């Protein structure tokens, strides 16, 4: 977060890919503070989206340029296999990770917490779910979260964590999230936007 | 499992790296074989390893023609870090989940069940956890592998799917299981007792 921000939309509303993926590409550390073993293997599934889309990218970045590109590369490419196939696959997956992390600190420097446990973020991280997630899983993966969500630290120390180098008081930092937010959140709603109009989108449980 | 199998030790009892790391990279395609999406970032995960261990051995494959080549370059390179980084942290927690499908599918062919419920394969996966990693994780990482086994399959399903693509009886093919098993347990074996001897084990939890 913070500090290698993404840079915001023109015009044609065009996102393109290799700026896109430099910066996307800093947000699985974050999942380290998260603090926890517990909380590996999902960045590793994040790594893992980004990783299939820059493997598309770079087999010609020219041919895609934007992340529209690749959907409508994809699209003639693959069959009716699509837009279950690929890279639109992968940022399908992605920008839902995106939106989470992005719906998650919003709750967080909005000070939207329990009142009875003020200094969870278990509130926080659940608001997220169903907002970005939830939808898309079945009751296992979402008892396992909830039971991950033991392993999710105090909000205090997970603010120290996504500062720690910069020497800020807390109250600081969260107004550098809240300035991060403001692109991030932009853009997720273009990529969204984006599959709801090239009809990428697939609604229901993997 | 089954078809691309590793070839037997020898008299140094070294095993080379390049053909160590071509043989199981076939191997997270198998958590396909569970049938779920809660799996996906269990293989994500062993992905991890294989890909930080193969970043390291192309560095200079002759450099770490072996598994002990390495484990001993990095203990020089890197100070009493070490073995807590690199390729050695690496393949120390890909050698269990190594070992983990090891004694599932050991458990598997030899017909361990549980009475009650006999083509479920939680007790199978139990076992293995158990002998394999559980020592090295907290309370959390175990109630969420509990109710992973839920989203797993029957084991009749669980074996069409190891053998897809090759129309053999179930009998068949536990016994073509039962001899990759030869060769598989032999080299787990043989880089847990490296560990040991050159003292790259961590025994505490993560
Ligand atoms: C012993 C140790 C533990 C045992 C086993 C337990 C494992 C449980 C793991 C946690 C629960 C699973 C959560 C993740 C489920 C994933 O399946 C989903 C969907 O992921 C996509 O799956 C897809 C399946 O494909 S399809 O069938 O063809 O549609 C794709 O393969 C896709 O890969 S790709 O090639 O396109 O690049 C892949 O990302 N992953 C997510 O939902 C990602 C969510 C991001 C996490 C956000 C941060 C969470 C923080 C939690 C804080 C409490
Ligand atoms: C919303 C969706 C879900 C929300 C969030 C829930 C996520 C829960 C995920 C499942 C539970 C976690 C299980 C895995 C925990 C991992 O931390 C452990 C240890 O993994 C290692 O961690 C290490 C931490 O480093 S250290 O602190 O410096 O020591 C390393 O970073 C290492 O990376 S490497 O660079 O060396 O390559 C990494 O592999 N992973 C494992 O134990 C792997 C086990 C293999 C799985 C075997 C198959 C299970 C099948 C289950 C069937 C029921």
Redesign the interface.
């Known amino acids: 977060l913070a500090e290698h921000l993404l840079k915001p939309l023109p015009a044609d509303k065009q996102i393109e890919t290799g700026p896109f993926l430099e910066a996307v590409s800093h947000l699985p550390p974050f999942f380290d503070c998260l603090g926890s073993?517990?909380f590996?293997?999902?960045k590793?599934?994040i790594?893992?989206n980004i990783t299939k889309i820059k493997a598309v990218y770079d087999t010609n970045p020219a041919k895609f340029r934007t992340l529209q590109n690749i959907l409508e590369v994809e699209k003639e490419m693959y069959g009716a296999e699509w837009p279950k196939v690929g890279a639109t696959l992968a940022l399908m997956w992605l920008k839902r990770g995106l939106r989470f992390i992005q719906v998650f600190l919003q709750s967080i420097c909005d000070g939207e917490r329990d009142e009875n446990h003020p200094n969870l973020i278990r509130v926080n991280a659940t608001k997220a779910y169903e907002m970005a997630l939830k939808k898309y899983?079945?009751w296992?993966?979402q008892?396992?979260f909830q039971?991950?969500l033991?392993?999710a630290p105090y909000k205090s120390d997970f603010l120290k964590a996504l500062s720690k180098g910069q020497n800020v008081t807390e109250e600081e930092c969260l107004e550098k999230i809240r300035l991060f937010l403001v692109n991030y959140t932009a853009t997720i709603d273009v990529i969204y936007e984006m599959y709801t109009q090239m009809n990428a989108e697939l609604n229901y449980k993997?």
Chains 1, 2 share one sequence.
């Open positions: 073993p517990v590996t293997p999902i590793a599934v790594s893992g899983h079945g296992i993966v008892k396992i039971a991950a033991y392993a993997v």
